[PDB]
């Protein structure tokens with residue numbers, strides 16, 4: 001094996017799919033989702049490498 | 050919100066953007082109209098009686 005599948009996942013749509021109240025509640029958690037997306041993007045860049 | 054370059058600068062929290070491709074926001078089609086579909090209204094209770 002050489003590479004995985006370059007999969008990326010959006011929190012706001014996953015956790016609170018098209019929901020205003022849920023998105024507002026999710027804002028309180030800070031950059032959990034920014035760092036989730038950062039980890040997944042780093043993985044994908046590594047796959048290309 | 051002025052332009053994509055400004056979105057990139059805001060996401061990176063920087064004024065100088067090193068060469069590359071950056072994921073800034075998420076595209077999402079918003080729903081236009083609402084649809085409500087229910088079975089045919091039948092057996093109207095005899096308040097006439």
Ligand SMILES: *[C@@H]1O[C@H](CO)[C@@H](O)[C@H](O)[C@H]1NC(C)=O
Nearest residue numbers: 091092093094095096097098
């Ligand atoms: C009683 O009959 C009249 C005429 O048919 C109708 O307008 C009225 O709504 C009926 N009453 C009820 C409770 O349906």
